[PDB]
Amino acid sequence: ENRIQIMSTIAKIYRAMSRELNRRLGELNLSYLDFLVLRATSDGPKTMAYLANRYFVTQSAITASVDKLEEMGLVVRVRDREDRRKILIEITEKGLETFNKGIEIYKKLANEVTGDLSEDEVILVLDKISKILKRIEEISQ
Amino acid sequence: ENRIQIMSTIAKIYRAMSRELNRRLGELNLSYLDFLVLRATSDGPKTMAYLANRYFVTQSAITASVDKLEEMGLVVRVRDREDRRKILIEITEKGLETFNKGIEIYKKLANEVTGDLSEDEVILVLDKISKILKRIEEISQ
Ligand SMILES: O=C(O)c1ccccc1O
Ligand SMILES: O=C(O)c1ccccc1O
Question: Can you tell me which residues bind Zn(2+) (chains A, B) (predicted)?
Answer without folding.
Answer: 80, 82
